[PDB]
Amino acid sequence: SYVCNVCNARFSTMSALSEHLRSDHRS
Amino acid sequence: STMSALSEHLRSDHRDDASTLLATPMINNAIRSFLTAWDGIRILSPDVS
Amino acid sequence: VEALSTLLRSVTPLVLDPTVLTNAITTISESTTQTISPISEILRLLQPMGNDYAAFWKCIASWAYNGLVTTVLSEDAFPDSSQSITHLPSMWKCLFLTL
Amino acid sequence: NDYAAFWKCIASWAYNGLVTTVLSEDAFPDSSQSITHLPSMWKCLFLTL
Amino acid sequence: NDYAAFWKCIASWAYNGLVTTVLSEDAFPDSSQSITHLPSMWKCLFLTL
Amino acid sequence: VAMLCGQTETNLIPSHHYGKAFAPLFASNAMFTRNQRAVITREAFVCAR
Amino acid sequence: VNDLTRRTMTGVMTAMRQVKTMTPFYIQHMCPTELSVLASVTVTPPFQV
Amino acid sequence: VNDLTRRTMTGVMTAMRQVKTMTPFYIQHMCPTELSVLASVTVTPPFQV
Amino acid sequence: EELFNALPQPLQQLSLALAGEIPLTDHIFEQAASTWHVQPRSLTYKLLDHIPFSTPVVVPPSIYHSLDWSKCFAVNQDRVERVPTIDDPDDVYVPNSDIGPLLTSLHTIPDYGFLHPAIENDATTLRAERARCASTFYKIASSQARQVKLDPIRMLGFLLLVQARPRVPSGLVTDQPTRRDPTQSPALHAIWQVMQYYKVAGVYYAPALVVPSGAIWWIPPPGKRNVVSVQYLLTDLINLAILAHMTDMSPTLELTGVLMYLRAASSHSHAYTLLQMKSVFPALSLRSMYRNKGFGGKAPAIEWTEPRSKYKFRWTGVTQLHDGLRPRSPSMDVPTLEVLTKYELVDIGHIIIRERNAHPRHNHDSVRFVRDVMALTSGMYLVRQPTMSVLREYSQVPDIKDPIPPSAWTGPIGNVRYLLPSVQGPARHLYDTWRAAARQIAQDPQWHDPLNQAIMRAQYVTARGGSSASLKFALKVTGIVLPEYDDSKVKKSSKIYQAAQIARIAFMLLIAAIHAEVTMGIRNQVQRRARSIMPLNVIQQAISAPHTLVANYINKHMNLSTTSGSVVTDKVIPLILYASTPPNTVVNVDIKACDASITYNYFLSVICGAMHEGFEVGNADAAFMGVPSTIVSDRRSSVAPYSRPISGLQTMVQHLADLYAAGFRYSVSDAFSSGNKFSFPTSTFPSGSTATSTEHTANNSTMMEYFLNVHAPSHVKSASLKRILTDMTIQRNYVCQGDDGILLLPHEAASKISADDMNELLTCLRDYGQLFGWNYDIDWSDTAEYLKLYALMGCRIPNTSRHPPVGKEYAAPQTDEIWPSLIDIVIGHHLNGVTDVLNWREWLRFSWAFACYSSRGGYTNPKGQSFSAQYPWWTFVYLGIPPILLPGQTPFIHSCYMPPGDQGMFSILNGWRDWLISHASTTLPPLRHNHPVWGLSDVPSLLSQFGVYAGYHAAQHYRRPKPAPETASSDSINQITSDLTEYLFYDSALKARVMKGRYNWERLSSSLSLNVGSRVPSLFDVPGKWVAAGRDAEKPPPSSVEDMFTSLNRCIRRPTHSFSRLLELYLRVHVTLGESIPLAIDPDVPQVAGADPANDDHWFKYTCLGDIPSATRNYFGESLFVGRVVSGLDVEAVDATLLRLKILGAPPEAFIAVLNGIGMSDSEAHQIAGRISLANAQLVQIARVVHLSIPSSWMTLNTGPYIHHHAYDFKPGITQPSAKSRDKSIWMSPILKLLCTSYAMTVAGPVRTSIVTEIDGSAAALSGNLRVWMRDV
RNA sequence: UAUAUAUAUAUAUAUAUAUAUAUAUAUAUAUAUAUAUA
RNA sequence: UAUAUAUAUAUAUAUAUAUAUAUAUAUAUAUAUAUAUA
Ligand SMILES: [Zn+2]
Structure with a gap:
């Protein structure tokens, strides 16, 4: 299904993709 | 050998460069700023059940 | 708080309209030979985080439950302490805080 | 219209006992405005004249 | 062209103490309403007559 | 703003x-259930104690 | 601060002070009524200090 | 209001006050004659109060 | 993918280019285009062999059950009718028959066939019945197949080509690869199975082939037979397959659509079967979404400003959703399922319902699901025999439940009767309303202004027209010898032509001609019956003027025409969004057939009487538009009858009422049928264009107002309903346009009205409409349907099915167009895929494939030579299609919102600048002397090597041939001119004004030496524009075509290395992008279905800017100085010239001459000229002076504030001081801002702040050159 | 022949209870893969 | 080989949702019987 290009995490619903994408990827 | 391999290298290696010859790292950087603003939204407007 | 706020906003006869303020702002005459326009700055600052305008009712609702929860000014709205009064955007923020 | 209002006002005098001419409501400054709002000030001037 | 109400009232006169004609409850102006609301004012006039 | x-x-x-x-907010027994x-x-608290 | 800008700043501030907003009146006279009524409606009564 | 604009506004108003219009004379001296004559021509005589 | 191996080498290369593997080049661009034009179309079907389908679809053999056509047609009263099979009188569409027996063989392609020459001859000469019936059947069947922008097989080839290889990922973190894949699409598998029937030796003969003259068919062998419905089924399948891929829907939904089409195709009358069960999909999904318990989510909070007449709305946050807000109306499952049981398709409903139940909460997924399912309805342009259409639509008369008694009228006034005061009811309301408006119109010196009179007369002339034959007959009948100008090669039926003939004649002589026949036309539709076009003649259009004028006043001065000012159509977007928000309850209404229900016996008689009475206040002797006052007999008093004069307006009414009472007399001459022209009258109102919307909107508003304020309170029962029904008025609760209308209820206090009261309310409204014969066709589903726009909970839903990828209307048996026009078709096609939010990456890929095929074409002389040409691909970039991958860049970095024209070029080059300069230095020797923008590295040679200049100039070339003049015809040209000028300049003052203005202008322009040859808009050229338009409407001769091809090729071959002067100067600016702007709204809240994190770029663009146009201080420049203008001239040209003059500092008399050149009197000219100032002008208003405009694609976004205070033309800490515009900034800054925002919109991803960083030359030098160019043009 | 009421049987829809299957979430155990440490 | 972390799969338990079957209740439709009216 939906997937994130940075960590290959896969999601059933787009809302889960959105919340993950916004929060999990940032001498 | 492929545009795919080149693109992955650009996203991964030159993740923070500012050379004008490259576009994609800047856009990704802008997206990161976009997300930070998104945090500012709900941080003062959460979601109730 | 959310329940009261939404319920409150349904019955009130008061309506909010940013337009009237903007007209009062933009009608100010100014010279075009200046490097900085205070008008543009305050207009840019005046627009909320989103086009939300909901915090007002949130403040009203909180009063009925001040024992449980307290509204507090958002920390990010404070002017940076390193700035000086001559830095106009910082000055405007200070004005909005005291209001 | 070659300013029909002017002649209309004059004609109304002959039959003032039957019909009266009034200033149109739309041709008023909005009560929400301040004196510094230039269009409002001009409107008020015209009404006075 | 029925005018049932008018004849009903006259007929009821002979049978008061058995049937009483009353003004329709919904014919009254709403209590919250104000005198400046013209449709309500007319209702009151007809109600009075 | x-x-x-x-x-x-x-x-x-305003009135x-x-x-x-x-x-519409005072049409039902909603306020009374909380009383019950x-x-x-x-009763439950006293008996338990 | 160059006086031209300084003149502008006091001007725009003056404009804000002259806006005939309704909110201050509503806070003093009408908002308390709305709270007083709604206090009997919410599933949780008010809790103040 | 910036004085330059204020200087302009008083200027244009001054210009209007100085226009050598003919209308005021016509109202006082000539228009009544036209009315007096036409009052005998219209199918409906004047009706004044 | 073995399919990729199956493709020929050039197509494999093209697929690689489309996938983003390699930068596209002209070489492969030609090879692909050429080979497509030479190989037989059947090979595209042959490609399907290499797809291992795995979908559960079976094509029943029930399809091949051709019903005999002979029983589907008959002639009676000498007209070929349709004789419906079922008892339903509406089964008048194309049947399901085997066309085979009516075919001969072609000499060019022996396999396919066309109609027997014997049949058409006998139908023509002998008028033989069966010959005619066969001919009619063949014609319409061919026409139905022709309703496509091009051959469907080509589109299928496009889809396979793009889908042959996965696109390369970009570097963007949101670039999700496609989830859908082939071998899972039921549509393609269905196409495979059905096409298996059409192969004899593994050849896959196409069931039909479209040609410019229609479509041809293949002769079946003795065993087989081809049913015409199969061709239609293929088109629907192909269209669905394309749409499903672009919308990226689950295969399950596509499966349902396939079963949907198959069931329809199995039965007879494929069109009729589809038409019957049309609304099933929207009812199953859109009308019933959130009728459950687990409801919730976020919704827009929209507020309607106090001056509601202005239609101004404000976004003011978001609202949490909860169960108390869930929709109240009953679902639509029961009726739809009941209907589906008839066609034993209950499985489809069960599948849809079960899938729908997986979206209990409102979010992106829910609306995306709704968008996809609603995209399943058939996208075919249905067409039927025009004879049946006209016979079925105009055969209806309204049924009045309480007619006005004859005793309710006064004595006649010659033709009209006034309404007795004692009569009350809705009719009285209607009578008073029109009468009051007529009074206001009566005294109005706005008319009799010669300029305004010019506007009205000029408004009557267009390139199109009709009924000219009736006109010539009627006037010739009355002894009027009209002029002729045939040598001037212009169509007689053009409204221009007849207007020229009339110019000299005294108007009253023409009065007898108004009672003449009117021709008619038909325009097909996608989801309904075909529309009608009924163009009146110029005289009739002139007579009906009072009706229009009064209607306009009613609209503009009551409910502000309910948006019928149509200033920008987007004003309805926020309206429906607000109307669909949870706090509001909305009801969709529309007259069943307003055109067919307005009539004289009830409606028009009342209006005519009211207008005639309303005009009584006014000088009885006052001619209007050349119609003098006349004497009429008054018979109101039986004891004292007499005759009195009446003004010209009343005389117009006298005739107008006579015409309406007589009823319109149409004459049908359909070409698809055979030898069956006839005429019959009807009371149906013409309603052929927007000129009818005014009358229907006025009556619509009037009846609604009376219903709300009078009828409903007196009749309804619920006390609560009465309480809420009162305190409600149309000006803030109702809008409409023609038949369409929207009614929204006052906000029930934190609650919703009982459905019981709603049912009571809706029922009473139906009865109220039934009274005077209006079927109101209302519905209540908590959604917003207005002008074919759909909103759900404040989110807009693009109904993609109304824009089928393959379908296109064609109203004639012949396409009648030339090859280069296909390019414009492609451009328009692509934009819809942007307006509707599709998967922007895949849509772009498909678009380029379409462009490649269109890029090439040819032509042959009627007897002699052939001609050919094709464009370099860079043309389409200039036309507004983003490139996929430039050499040295990364694919998919350009957003679809990239502006067309020079702006798109500049933005592309600006981003591409540094790579080009550096690369040119390495590859090529330096140029011989320094360059303003470039160093010595000589990029222009590199651009020429890329063929950029070729494409850039090729797109500038015209694409329609030009007709040739002649000298004796020029005597007719002069005769045409003279008369057009005579018709235009009825009086003399206007002619004096224009002549003085022109004389002064050229004198000033030359003497002051501004320039010479400035084509300034002036009235003297308006007839010239009309003449050119009239001549252009004609089919061009072949010589013009040959000139086009030769000129185009020469323009392609000519080696040029420069853009336009403007673009050259624009390249001098350097623009950079900063961080993202603060967000407009919460990204969680959906605003447009499909503009979600999956479709990232749209999702970015909408989220950053916000959709609601909210120009609180900009007004988007709609305050043009010249509010009143004549047709033909362009306002956008006029203000551009005026501002250009003002910037050039021309003396005031220059403005006076220009203004006087378009009829403005000296006094108003001075008044207008004074208003011109650089201060009050808006950013776009001034920026347009150099043709910098806003792309249409942006019209749905709130770009105002961004352009105002987010495009820094001079940031102090960043800009080089050389770029400081200084005092000229008053008119320089808008230009820079427009350039900046154009570049920002070009790139993909979130919107960022745009900053000018440097101009290679000094800003002063840039301003100076611009002033020079402004002075030059 | 039609309408109304009652009883019986069949079908459809809704609610409650029980059983079976599927999907999602959480916890525990086992197996496989990847990374780190010994 | 052992330990830790992450991912996937299987099994078990708990919870939620959907579908199917059985039982009970209500409503609608159809059929049969009885009664009443026309
Ligand atoms: Zn991720």
């Missing part, structure tokens, strides 16, 4: 407006 951009209808009568607004629950809570 809310403080400075507050406006209402030209000729508002009338609130009269319409609050009408409070009583049962009282």
Whole structure:
């Protein structure tokens, strides 16, 4: 299904993709 | 050998460069700023059940 | 708080309209030979985080439950302490805080 | 219209006992405005004249 | 062209103490309403007559 | 913005407006269920103690 | 601060002070009524200090 | 209001006050004659109060 | 993918280019285009062999059950009718028959066939019945197949080509690869199975082939037979397959659509079967979404400003959703399922319902699901025999439940009767309303202004027209010898032509001609019956003027025409969004057939009487538009009858009422049928264009107002309903346009009205409409349907099915167009895929494939030579299609919102600048002397090597041939001119004004030496524009075509290395992008279905800017100085010239001459000229002076504030001081801002702040050159 | 022949209870893969 | 080989949702019987 290009995490619903994408990827 | 391999290298290696010859790292950087603003939204407007 | 706020906003006869303020702002005459326009700055600052305008009712609702929860000014709205009064955007923020 | 209002006002005098001419409501400054709002000030001037 | 109400009232006169004609409850102006609301004012006039 | 951009209808009568607004909110026994629950809570608490 | 800008700043501030907003009146006279009524409606009564 | 604009506004108003219009004379001296004559021509005589 | 191996080498290369593997080049661009034009189309079907389908679809053999056509047609009263099979009188569409027996063989392609020459001859000469019936059947069947922008097989080839290889990922973190894949699409598998029937030796003969003259068919062998419905089924399948891929829907939904089409195709009358069960999909999904318990989510909070007439709305946050807000109306499942049981398709409903139940909460997924399912309805342009259409639509008369008694009228006034005061009811309301408006119109010196009179007369002339034959007959009948100008090669039926003939004649002589026949036309539709076009003649259009004028006043001065000012159509977007928000309850209404229900016996008689009475207040002797006052007999008093004069307006009414009472007399001459022209009258109102919307909107508003304020309170029962029904008025609760209308209820206090009361309310409205014969066709589903726009909970839903990828209307048996026009078709096609939010990456890929095929074409002389040409691909970039991958860049970095024209070029080059300069230095020797923008590295040679200049100039070349003049015809040209000028300049003052203005202008322009040859808009050229338009409407001769091809090729071959002067100067600016702007709204809240994190770029663009146009201080420049203008001239040209003059500092008399050149009197000219100032002008208003405009694609976004205070033309800490515009900034800054925002919109991803960083030359030098160019043009 | 009421049987829809299957979430155990440490 | 972390799969338990079957209740439709009216 939906997937994130940075960590290959896969999601059933787009809302889960959105919340993950916004929060999990940032001498 | 492929545009795919080149693109992955650009996203991964030159993740923070500012050379004008490259576009994609800047856009990704802008997206990161976009997300930070998104945090500012709900941080003062959460979601109730 | 959310329940009261939404319920409150349904019955009130008061309506909010940013337009009237903007007209009062933009009608100010100014010279075009200046490097900085205070008008543009305050207009840019005046627009909320989103086009939300909901915090007002949130403040009203909180009063009925001040024992449980307290509204507090958002920390990010404070002017940076390193700035000086001559830095106009910082000055405007200070004005909005005291209001 | 070659300013029909002017002649209309004059004609109304002959039959003032039957019909009266009034200033149109739309041709008023909005009560929400301040004196510094230039269009409002001009409107008020015209009404006075 | 029925005018049932008018004849009903006259007929009821002979049978008061058995049937009483009353003004329709919904014919009254709403209590919250104000005198400046013209449709309500007319209702009151007809109600009075 | 809310403080400075507050406006209402030209000729508002507050008593009338609130009269319409609050009408549906007092049509049922909703307020009384909490009273009944409070009583049962009282009895339950005492007996448990 | 160049006086031209300084003149502008006091001007725009003056404009804000002159806006005929409705909110201050509503806070003092009408908002308390709305709270007083709604206090009997919410599933949780008010809790103040 | 910036004085330059204020200087302009008083200027244009001054210009209007100085226009050598003919209308005021016509109202006082010539228009009544036209009315007096036409009053005998219209199918409906004047009706004044 | 073995399919990729199956493709020929050039197509494999093209697929690689489309996938983003390699930068596209002209070489492969030609090879692909050429080979497509030479190989037989059947090979595209042959490609399907290499797809291992795995979908559960079976094509029943029930399809091949051709019903005999002979029983589906008959002639009676000498007209070929349709004789419906079922008892339903509406089964008048194309049947399901085997066309085979009516075919001969072609000499060019022996396999396919066309109609027997014997049949058409006998039908023509002998008028033989069966010959005619066969001919009619063949014609319409061919026409139905022709309703496509091009051959469907080509589109299928496009889809396979793009889908042959996965696109390369970009570097963007949101670039999700496609989830859908082939071998899972039921549509393609269905196409495979059905096409298996059409192969004899593994050849896959196409069931039909479209040609410019229609479509041809293949002769079946003795065993087989081809049913015409199969061709239609293929088109629907192909269209669905394309749409499903672009919308990226689950295969399950596509499966349902396939079963949907198959069931329809199995039965007879494929069109009729589809038409019957049309609304099933929207009812199953859109009308019933959130009728459950687990409801919730976020929704827009929209507020309607106090001056509601202005239609101004404000976004003011978001609202949490909860169960108390869930929709109240009953679902639509029961009726739809009941209907589906008839066609035993209950499985489809069960599948849809079960899938729908997986979206209990409102979010992106829910609306995306709704968008996809609603995209399943058939996208075919249905067409039927025009004879049946006209016979079925105009055969209806309204049924009045309480007619006005005859005793309710006064004595006649010659033709009209006034309404007795004692009569009350809705009719009285209607009578008073029109009468009051007529009074206001009566005294109005706005008319009799010669300029305004010019506007009305000029408004009557267009390139199109009709009824000219009736006109010539009627006037010739009355002894009027009209002029002729045939040598001037212009169509007689053009409204221009007849207007020229009339110019000299005294108007009253023409009065007898108004009672003449009117021709008619038909325009097909996608989801309904075909529309009608009924163009009146110029005289009739002139007579009906009072009706229009009064209607306009009613609209503009009551409910502000309910948006019928149509200033920008987007004003309805926020309206429906607000109307669909949870706090509001909305009801969709529309007259069943307003055109067919307006009539004289009830409606028009009342209006005519009211207008005639309303005009009584006014000088009885006052001619209007050349119609003098006359004497009429008054018979109101039986004891004292007499005759009195009546003004010209009343005389117009006298005739107008006579015409309406007589009823319109149409004459049908359909070409698809055979030898069956006839005429019959009807009371149906013409309603052929927007000129009818005014009358229907006025009556619509009037009846609604009376219903709300009078009828409903007196009749309804629920006390609560009465309480809420009162305190409600149309000006803030109702809008409409023609038949369409929207009614929204006052906000029930934190609650919703009982459905019981709603049912009571809706029922009473139906009865109220039934009274005077209006079927109101209302519905209540908590959604917003207005002008074919759909909103759900404040989110807009693009109904993609109304824009089928393959379908296109064609109203004639012949396409009648030339090859280069296909390019414009492609451009328009692509934009819809942007307006509707599709998967922007895949849509772009498909678009380029379409462009490649269109890029090439040819032509042959009627007897002699052939001609050919094709464009370099860079043309389409200039036309507004983003490139996929430039050499040295990364694919998919350009957003679809990239502006067309020079702006798109500049933005592309600006981003591409540094790579080009550096690369040119390495590859090529330096140029011989320094360059303003470039160093010595000589990029222009590199651009020429890329063929950029070729494409850039090729797109500038015209694409329609030009007709040739002649000298004796020029005597007719002069005769045409003279008369057009005579018709235009009825009086003399206007002619004096224009002549003085022109004389002064050229004198000033030359003497002051501004320039010479400035084509300034002036009235003297308006007839010239009309003449050119009239001549252009004609089919061009072949010589013009040959000139086009030769000129185009020469323009392609000519080696040029420069853009336009403007673009050259624009390249001098350097623009950079900063961080993202603060967000407009919460990204969680959906605003447009499909503009979600999956479709990232749209999702970015909408989220950053916000959709609601909210120009609180900009007004988007709609305050043009010249509010009143004549047709033909362009306002956008006029203000551009005026501002250009003002910037050039021309003396005031220059403005006076220009203004006087378009009829403005000296006094108003001075008044207008004074208003011109650089201060009050808006950013776009001034920026347009150099043709910098806003792309249409942006019209749905709130770009105002961004352009105002987010495009820094001079940031102090960043800009080089050389770029400081200084005092000229008053008119320089808008230009820079427009350039900046154009570049920002070009790139993909979130919107960022745009900053000018440097101008290679000094800003002063840039301003100076611009002033020079402004002075030059 | 039609309408109304009652009883019986069949079908459809809704609610409650029980059983079976599927999907999602959480916890525990086992197996496989990847990374780190010994 | 052992330990830790992450991912996937299987099994078990708990919870939620959907579908199917059985039982009970209500409503609608159809059929049969009885009664009443026309
Ligand atoms: Zn991720």
